[PDB]
Design an enzyme around this catalytic site. Structure first.
Site, PDB file in Angstrom:
ATOM      1  CD  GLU A 235      -3.158  -1.196   2.010  1.00  0.00           C
ATOM      2  OE1 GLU A 235      -3.188  -0.340   2.933  1.00  0.00           O
ATOM      3  OE2 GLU A 235      -4.097  -2.031   1.811  1.00  0.00           O
ATOM      4  CD  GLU A 340      -3.820  -6.390   2.972  1.00  0.00           C
ATOM      5  OE1 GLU A 340      -2.573  -6.266   3.017  1.00  0.00           O
ATOM      6  OE2 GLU A 340      -4.582  -5.515   3.407  1.00  0.00           O
ATOM      7  CB  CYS A 342      -9.420  -7.710   5.275  1.00  0.00           C
ATOM      8  SG  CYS A 342      -8.871  -6.014   5.035  1.00  0.00           S
ATOM      9  CG  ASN A 370     -10.680 -10.062  -7.495  1.00  0.00           C
ATOM     10  OD1 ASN A 370      -9.698  -9.354  -7.698  1.00  0.00           O
ATOM     11  ND2 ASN A 370     -11.624  -9.753  -6.587  1.00  0.00           N
TER      12      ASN A 370
END
Ligand SMILES: *[C@@H]1O[C@H](CO)[C@@H](O)[C@H](O)[C@H]1NC(C)=O
Length: 497
Positions: A235, A340, A342, A370
């Site tokens: 990030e 990643e 979440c 995705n």
């Protein structure tokens, strides 16, 4: 083999209870004849990846939605599925007695579990750590003589990764990502906050930071672990934000481009680890296509970039077409990979919601989205957390598919675990997404892939309250007559020959 022991904590569905002597588990995979399908079903009502078999028939008796396999229409090949071995995940797993540890790892990695083949490994500390540290905290060690792995690596992460590989159904790929550099390389001299690397690409700060990547890879290689890939920074956009509370290291896309071109690419390429893949971005999807444009339109950077790593926070909107779709259209030869994900991160959401069917649906929905937009893999965040969502040295704010209660030597497998498993267990590396045509508008989410051996896999998610009568057609085999119950997910598998 062993069924779910269900426990309710007041949410919409149950967790499956595991302890030192019991965990739910599958028998070895068994291949039914052409003309028979396998179906694995989970439901909000409590079914957990339950196996049933049925006929694929020459006649077509359903009159509702038809999904037709189009095996000749080929899309991306799949790298894999997995999750992150953070300090927090490792602390939690190792808090269990050894037999319970083994049942947890088998759950994720074995054929008796859901067949994970990816592990993401933080390079030193992040928010899911119980202290701040890097591998080179000794100031002004530009040559990194005092670079070393702490106990978080040597005692917690590395032995657990070894044990995962040992139990692994399939070869497992390791992916590394750094949150912060040593603070003496940073403009703000701090582990967190708005701050970047000091100076400019090509300089001593930038070269030491690239060398740190190689030292990390060297250190893990000494412990007989090798990496498939590294990301250029976790990030990078976070380190551009004033007050950012977590370990970070800010890069503009231009700064990332130049660091990759001048330091990181050439440094990796000149090392014994030159076969390690480099992924760029490793950040939220709304940063695309702009970041991809900046980095990849520079031949000097593009030549070292194998792929674009994306994050998403599932409680938020980010239309896939304008982000993933457009990036693929502009850069069709650069793989997209989800590194990643979440859930639970909004102020008002409980960090851990034991048995949340909604959070399981958010997971499977995101994976489907995705795969429908070219992404070759999908990686969860923490493999495990405690019941409060920790440990996190800043603040707990997200959920995990496995929650450990050390006080009871037990762990709970959330709906998220089985929703991930519906894909991870049944989509080996090198499976390829293929066409699946919906005969009419409908409320399901579906995706079809073909295994390396040519057999079919279809996942069908129903996020509605209503049962949907469904026919699946395979041109080479016939018609699979079925029903997608409200609040269910199914994986269908079948021989095509
Ligand atoms: C582990 O779970 C199994 C199955 O529910 C149960 O029979 C046993 O009591 C558990 N172990 C302990 C110590 O509670």
């Amino acid at each position: 083999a062993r069924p779910c022991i269900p426990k309710s904590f007041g949410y919409s569905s149950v967790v499956c209870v595991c302890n030192a002597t019991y965990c739910d588990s599958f028998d070895p995979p068994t291949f039914p004849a052409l003309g028979t399908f396998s179906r694995y079903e989970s439901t909000r009502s409590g079914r957990r990846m339950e196996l049933s078999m049925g006929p694929i028939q020459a006649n077509h008796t359903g009159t509702g939605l038809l999904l037709t396999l189009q095996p000749e229409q080929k899309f991306q090949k799949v790298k894999g599925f997995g999750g992150a071995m953070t300090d927090a995940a490792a602390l939690n797993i190792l808090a269990l007695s050894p037999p319970a540890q083994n049942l947890l790892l088998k759950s994720y990695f074995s054929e008796e579990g859901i067949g994970y083949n990816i592990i993401r490994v933080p390079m030193a500390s992040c928010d899911f750590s119980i202290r701040t540290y890097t591998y080179a905290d000794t100031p002004d060690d530009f040559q990194l003589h005092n670079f070393s792995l702490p106990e978080e690596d040597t005692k917690l992460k590395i032995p657990l990764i070894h044990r995962a590989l040992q139990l692994a159904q399939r070869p497992v790929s390791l992916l590394a990502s750094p949150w912060t550099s040593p603070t003496w390389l940073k403009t703000n001299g701090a582990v967190n906050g708005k701050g970047s690397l000091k100076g400019q690409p090509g300089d001593i700060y930038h070269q030491t930071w690239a060398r740190y990547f190689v030292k990390f890879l060297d250190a893990y290689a000494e412990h007989k672990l090798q990496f498939w890939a590294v990301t250029a920074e976790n990030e990078p956009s976070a380190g551009l934000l004033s007050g950012y509370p977590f370990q970070c290291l800010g890069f503009t896309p231009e700064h990332q481009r130049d660091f990759i071109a001048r330091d990181l690419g050439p440094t990796l390429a000149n090392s014994t680890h030159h076969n390690v893949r480099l992924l760029m971005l490793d950040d939220q999807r709304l940063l695309l296509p702009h970041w991809a444009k900046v980095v990849l339109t520079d031949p000097e950077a593009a030549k070292y970039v194998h792929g674009i790593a994306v994050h998403w926070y599932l409680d938020f909107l980010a239309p896939a077409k304008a982000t993933l779709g457009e990036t693929h259209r502009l850069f069709p030869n650069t793989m997209l990979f989800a590194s990643e994900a979440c859930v639970g991160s909004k102020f008002w959401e409980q960090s851990v919601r034991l048995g949340s069917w909604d959070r399981g649906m958010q997971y499977s929905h995101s994976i489907i989205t995705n795969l429908l937009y070219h992404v070759v893999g999908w990686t969860d965040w923490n493999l495990a957390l405690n019941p409060e969502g920790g440990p996190n040295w800043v603040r707990n704010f997200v959920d995990s598919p496995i929650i450990v209660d050390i006080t009871k030597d037990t762990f709970y497998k959330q709906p998220m675990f089985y929703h991930l498993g519906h894909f991870s267990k049944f989509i080996p590396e090198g499976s390829q997404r293929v066409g699946l045509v919906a005969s009419q508008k409908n409320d399901l989410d579906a995706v079809a892939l073909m295994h390396p051996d040519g057999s079919a896999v279809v996942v069908v998610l129903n996020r509605s309250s209503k049962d949907v009568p469904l026919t699946i057609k395979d041109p080479a085999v016939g018609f699979l007559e079925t029903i997608s119950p409200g609040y269910s997910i199914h994986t269908y598998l079948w021989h095509r020959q």
